Amino acid sequence: MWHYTSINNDTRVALDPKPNQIRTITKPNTVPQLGTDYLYTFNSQRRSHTLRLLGPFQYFNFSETDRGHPLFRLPLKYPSKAIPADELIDNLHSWMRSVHLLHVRSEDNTLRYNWMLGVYARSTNYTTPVGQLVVNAPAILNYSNPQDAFNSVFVALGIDYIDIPITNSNIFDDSSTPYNVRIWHAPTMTEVNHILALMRKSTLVSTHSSWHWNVLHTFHYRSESDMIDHFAAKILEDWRQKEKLDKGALVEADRVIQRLIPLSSSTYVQRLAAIGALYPNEFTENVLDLSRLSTALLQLSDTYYQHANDQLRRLYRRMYNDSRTLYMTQRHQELLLAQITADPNILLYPYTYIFTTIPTSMNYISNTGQGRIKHSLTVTGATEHDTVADIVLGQTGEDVITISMVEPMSIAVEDMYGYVLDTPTRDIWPADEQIEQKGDAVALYDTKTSRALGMFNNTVRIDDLLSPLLSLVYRTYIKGDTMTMTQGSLDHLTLCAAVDSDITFVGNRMIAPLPEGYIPKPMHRNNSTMKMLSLYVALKKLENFATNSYLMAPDTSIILLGAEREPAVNILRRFNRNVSNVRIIGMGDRAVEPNIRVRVPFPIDKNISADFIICDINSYEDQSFESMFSETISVVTTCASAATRALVKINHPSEYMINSVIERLSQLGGVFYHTALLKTASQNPYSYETYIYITPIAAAVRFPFYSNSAMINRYMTAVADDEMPIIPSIHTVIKGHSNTYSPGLFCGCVDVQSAPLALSQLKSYCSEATTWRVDSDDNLVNIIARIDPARIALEFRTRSNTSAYHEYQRYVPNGLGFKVRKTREFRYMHREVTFIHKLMMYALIREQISLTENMTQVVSIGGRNLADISVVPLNMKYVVIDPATRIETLTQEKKNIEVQSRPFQFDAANMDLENNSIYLFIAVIMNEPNGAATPARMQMDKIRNVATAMLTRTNCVAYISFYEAGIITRLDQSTAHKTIRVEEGRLKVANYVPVDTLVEADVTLMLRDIGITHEIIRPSTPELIDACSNYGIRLGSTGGAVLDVFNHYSPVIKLVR
Amino acid sequence: MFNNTVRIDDLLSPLLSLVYRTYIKGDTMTMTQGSLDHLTLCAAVDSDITFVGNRMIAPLPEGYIPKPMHRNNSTMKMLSLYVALKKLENFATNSYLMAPDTSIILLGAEREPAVNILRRFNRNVSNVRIIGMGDRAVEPNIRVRVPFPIDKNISADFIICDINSYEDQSFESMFSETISVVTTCASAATRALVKINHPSEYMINSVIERLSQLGGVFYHTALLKTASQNPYSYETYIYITPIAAAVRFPFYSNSAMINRYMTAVADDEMPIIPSIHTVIKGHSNTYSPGLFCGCVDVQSAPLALSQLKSYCSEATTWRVDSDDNLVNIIARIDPARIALEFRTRSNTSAYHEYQRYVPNGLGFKVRKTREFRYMHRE
Amino acid sequence: KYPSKAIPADELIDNLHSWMRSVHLLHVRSEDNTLRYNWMLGVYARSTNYTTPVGQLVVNAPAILNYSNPQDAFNS
Amino acid sequence: PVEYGIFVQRGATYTINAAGEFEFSGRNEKWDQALYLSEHFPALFSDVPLAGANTIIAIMRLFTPQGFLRTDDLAIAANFPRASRNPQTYIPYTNQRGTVTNEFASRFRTIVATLANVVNERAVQDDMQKATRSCTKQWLRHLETQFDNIAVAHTDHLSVVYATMSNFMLNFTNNFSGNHATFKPDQYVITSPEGSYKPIIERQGETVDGLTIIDTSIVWPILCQCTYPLVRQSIMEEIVYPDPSTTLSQSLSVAQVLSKLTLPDAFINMILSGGDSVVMRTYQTEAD
Amino acid sequence: TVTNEFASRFRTIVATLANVVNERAVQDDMQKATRSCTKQWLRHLETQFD
Ligand SMILES: Nc1nc2c(ncn2[C@@H]2O[C@H](COP(=O)(O)OP(=O)(O)OP(=O)(O)O)[C@@H](O)[C@H]2O)c(=O)[nH]1
Ligand SMILES: Nc1nc2c(ncn2[C@@H]2O[C@H](COP(=O)(O)OP(=O)(O)OP(=O)(O)O)[C@@H](O)[C@H]2O)c(=O)[nH]1
Ligand SMILES: Nc1ncnc2c1ncn2[C@@H]1O[C@H](COP(=O)(O)OP(=O)(O)OP(=O)(O)O)[C@@H](O)[C@H]1O
Ligand SMILES: C[S@@+](CC[C@H](N)C(=O)[O-])C[C@H]1O[C@@H](n2cnc3c(N)ncnc32)[C@H](O)[C@@H]1O
Ligand SMILES: C[S@@+](CC[C@H](N)C(=O)[O-])C[C@H]1O[C@@H](n2cnc3c(N)ncnc32)[C@H](O)[C@@H]1O
Ligand SMILES: C[S@@+](CC[C@H](N)C(=O)[O-])C[C@H]1O[C@@H](n2cnc3c(N)ncnc32)[C@H](O)[C@@H]1O
């Protein structure tokens, strides 16, 4: 598709009306209409009005009388706001009525009326010789042949040319015109040549490659800057046109070479003409910034003036030394020849040269316009690096980047009110177990739990996490934008938690509109409010699970036993206004009214009872463990005695403490208390504090004691740290292949030229990196990129430093972002619970692996996209056996990583387990490679097969992850599981198919029958803290509730030989 | 040339903007949540729209006039590919919203307005990942090369590739590139919808063979072409999807979508640019395809119609006003009428009937009229 | 102008907007990424209308306001 | 004061860039004529729109010239010396043949309409009495009448005197282009390699017997207390068409003097031109 | 400086006093001419002050 197909035409001639049409050309009878007769726009930002007449009127000189019309006075009358369409239409209409162009209507169909000379003569009020010639003989304006229209008047006047002023396009500006267009009497090509050659000896003149009305016309500039801005706009036009032509589309090019040909100009114009005629690749790639076009054009010229390509440089130089010559590619020239063959006497510019376009392979990425780029850096590339120098990142203002401490949660309102259960497992509590658990509980309470865990608990507050969601409900209710919801709905409870004023539905599912002028104050919530609310919802769901309404039943009561102001009692009182007779009271030692101020145990005289109790008692004072123990025992006892459904808090949920609770409940006469541990989503994500749930039932409870409960493990496994908590640093100096970085994030700015290099260097650490420039003019490019431990574990396996730097240099300068808006990164980004559990399991397995001695290799079967790479040490060889893994032989060879790329056979004969090897089977055992779930008996079968297969080799360690059965019992009873599910009895993590679960006892019994050594470990609190500290991940609430029961029920079998 | 003149963007602009002007006045009202009219409304305006209840879009906030959505040429096509994947997942559906807890990837990306329109379309649906992922991608879309880097993990219920190398390149390079593209697209999703820039029989068969070489999954496949593609582009969307059975008759031969490309070849003649004729010769047969267009004295008008019946099968005419004596005429040249009239040298016409027209019997129209060089036909 | 009642958002926005348009701080833009602009001395010099010696020093040599090391901004 | 603040924050002056964009100083400084030959321009006359200063832009539009840029054709044919590569002069007003309304007057009419609005707004702001306000308006319309009445003579007579004076031998430079935004006189000097250059235009400040101080007040006598041969027509003064010979013979005399005035200097400097020299060492690369 | 800050302060001061004296003037329903005379003497003061 080489040859251009374009239909050339003199568009400016086609615009000139037939003489018969001039009388009604203003359409005197009817109002001018927008979008047809005019275009008005008010740019409120620049506060500039802009009118633009359409049709023949787009070229209209205005007489000073026309300027005196009120229409042109309008923008002054409305300095700040748009001219109303009424006034604009009426003024433009009456002014339009005022205009009248001298003309003689005729019968011959061949005539056209010379609109230019007509309106021009009118504007000068018929004073100039053309104006006189016209007012005396209007019939002179009619023309058959377009050129003779002017020859008639040059002959009539005897003048060699007419200097005709240009109209401004907007009719509101009255600015003095940058140039004017002279029109020469040059009937033949020879006259055109002589005039051009004379023009090439006179200041500030230029011209088009061809002329409308087939009559020569030159532009004459008042100043050099005007010549520059004109040349710029024309170059842009010819580049857009040539771009459209090269795509091969048919196009109505009014003239084949749109750009101007300087005849006499300053140097800078000659540079514009030169790069302009190059049709440089940079325009198609949008490498230039068009907002400041001529500047960019001047800049482009300079590079072409000293271009690395000899061809382009000699070509540009040549064009610069012969500026008067028009340069064109051959594909243009054929269009010129076609245009000549159609109309033999057409005039076009005599002095021309046909250069061959020089190909250039540099395919720049680019995109002007808003949007930061979110890079995904490759581990490796074609480029080799040798000892790249450290790259400092600049200081950045808060106007560009800010770093908030924690990412606020995004979540549906219902998800906040969920909770998880953990039922008792042990059938008995033997005394030796009591002494052991007491020793662990006392040793643990005596020295406070991990300082890092307490840091995350004290930074990831639930109040701040839920504030952006809660206030959003306030702002919507405040506008009246909120509407339908059920009476008992959780969205209703959130609405109660947003605003201090009582709300009331006008009828079913319709909240009352606010009284006029009223803007109720948002409800005041302390950190524990929403948690108390979710405990209320929890007690409601526990009383019966099917319910959707959460209103209290009529004639019932609830007590929020720990209290200060306790906003929750007020919100709840407000929630139940439509329900008759519902006692609701806080009852703390620090209680303010409405709540009664009272100590627990209750004074013997005082009578207290309720259908529900929600204790949140917690001693602020430091105290002995025996005192805290007796206090919590008296608290749970008094809470259980006083209600049919207690929901006690436990600040120190050791196994010994909870078992002491169940034993003490056992000691009370005549009531068998069913019980369960619990954790709501509105708790602070990291708090180990756990809500025990007591309730009488007629039967004695089988398996009443706890052991290895998840909620308890969350607390007990945390212990005083051997290291200070890892504070997230903000790095600036990017060393080339260093591996000295503490977890945190790179953040800063570089020159746009250095930017491809800097991205290529930080791919060593960061797995991805957002970048952007603030504006087209500012040359600094901001970059943010958090450090991925997994990418460090990948890139530092060998000393080679490959990167896609060649690809990154396609970005400079427009290809890597723009964003005027301030951006706000968080030190702790959100991540889904499955991903977090995966990272915790990786921390557990990695710390476990570093202890192991003398093993040649790690083999992660089912490794996907090297997901387990964080686990393996930089030394020992890594292997993957996921069929779905993509191959990268350069990356594999460079990074010491074999990839089997075939399904792994679990059958013992097929098995080929090496000596001195660590076999990871993380989460792969539960699925077939095609993604369909494998039945649990088949899972147990393949585990048994891996066991017997590794039974023979002397040194090996398998890690078979799987899902324990008990979790399905718990999620059947829980609520807060936006991710995890229980479809038809199978776990359904993420988007994965539901998959049947193993029971831990049968698996352990099988491994004991095999005779192999094993140890069913699961990751604990310190592992969680390591994953969060390293990856820069805050937990989030729903994940905070679900994570313990989820983590406990993904056991990791650790076969060892 | 036809592909570069008959752009789909310009073809659909008058319809799309009309949806904008109506929504802007608040004149638009009822429509279903998942309806195609809803998707068009999302494709018209930049602002998020929300129903106040069933089948009823919210009235605009007072004084607010949201900016129309910015669409490049490939936007609507990407949307129709989305609708296509929806209809392919099941045919009975009327709602086109994504199911909750699902994802889709628009693999070729720049700004990719379609990802934004689609994100906007599904606001009422919980949990729906939607991202572009091109090498030239701007945010929200991730910027990344294909094949995916080995470390990076990508998967979705749907993939809509539109990868296309701008650079000139060797055929073997383009072949290996498209193979890696289809392979990576099929591996990453249960329902890929890959573009094929050069849909030769050899290329598509290479695709099915390469899909055959992958272990353990039998990929059902079909060639496809959406209405929102440029009318003349031979570019074709192959549609991969796993099925439990091995597919009988998996290879292509003489497929229509392939024939659209393969039968096109370098021309023996330059493309015929449509001329605008003025001089009506009496029985000439020298006219290149195009159209007569001009004006004559009202007296000559019966004659001129009688002469151009030799070429044009029909001819609109009118005078601008009662006072103006010129009569404008437009008449495109029908090859069929030329093939009829030039069979013999006789030059009969209903000139006697046409002279009954002068002067009032052949049109009036003060309004400007706009003929096209390329008229619509079924 | 509004002794008793809140200033309407229209008037507040338009007035703050035009006053904001009126302000302009002397500065020399630069290419090096390490620079920061000494906002304190800039706006301070502007407030005194460039009369105090810091104001003079700034109106004559605005590039003095740019600083890499924060302390040297004042030592200069 | 508000629009002024917004305006002068952009800058009291500007300079055109090599790319042709304007670059305003950002500083509020009083102008001096020392700046006339500088890169600097007064910022009032940039005619560049500003977001909040529309009244100032529009008021400065009143200062835009109503004339035209005639080319010096008769002065070319005579081969009279001209510093410009295409000689040209801005003639302040067009001839207004045959018109009922003078365009030059009608412009001034719109001008006083604008100024009327401005002076009136400033009047209601100062809460001044109605009578004085109407007196201002009356004096304005009176001016507009005097201006029409004079305008016929300024356009139809003075213009051919500017046009004829544009062709005179010694009027060798371009005076204007019509663009206040961008017109800067071309600045030649007589540079020498062995000395400092002499600018031809300089703020040498010598008043040349008061030639270079410009009283604007002079427009008042013109509008009000002066008569013209054309305005008088009800006596009909015949127009004067002065003989060429008086100015030509003078211009020639000057050209004759200053032509030969440099001659002895020219001859000697012509001889000595090769004589300027630099000290140079010649090291020897090879023996003998 | 082109504008003296010491003058500009006094300028705002007389703007305030102008508003005050004017309000006291319309309250006492006094004739327009005297009122404008007060304003004129104020602006005159502002000039003397610059
Ligand atoms: N005063 C006046 N100027 C005209 C008229 N028609 C065309 N021009 C001017 O003639 C100049 C050159 O004409 P063209 O070659 O047809 O168009 P162009 O150079 O691409 O410039 P534009 O089309 O105006 O952007 C333009 O700058 C126009 O402003 C007219 O009818 N009246
Ligand atoms: N005039 C002016 N004062 C500043 C600027 N920046 C800081 N200050 C003042 O410097 C004083 C001490 O600065 P800092 O130590 O940073 O802040 P601070 O003492 O805690 O006082 P504040 O942050 O203002 O509450 C504060 O009282 C500020 O008012 C500035 O840019 N201009
Ligand atoms: N882009 C260009 N195109 C053509 N000629 C150039 C270009 N740049 C410089 N030259 C020539 O080389 C000389 C270099 O001058 P110099 O670079 O010092 O200042 P300049 O002319 O303003 O150019 P620049 O804008 O690159 O500084 C000029 O005299 C000019 O003739
Ligand atoms: C951690 S606060 C939380 C209270 C409630 N969730 C709130 O803030 O609205 C627990 C409160 O219980 C109170 N408290 C401690 N011991 C108590 C006891 N023995 N009897 C009653 N209240 C007690 C404390 O004063 C403390 O303020
Ligand atoms: C459930 S996914 C994720 C596993 C785990 N999250 C990880 O990244 O290590 C397990 C992967 O193992 C692969 N796989 C499934 N069955 C396999 C088998 N029998 N042998 C080897 N790989 C298998 C699949 O391709 C799948 O992508
Ligand atoms: C024809 S464009 C269409 C993209 C999309 N339909 C749009 O415009 O919103 C295809 C894009 O894919 C990108 N691309 C080309 N090769 C690629 C590759 N190997 N991997 C990822 N993207 C690629 C190109 O940069 C090109 O911009």
Ligand SMILES: [Mg+2]
């Ligand atoms: Mg044009």
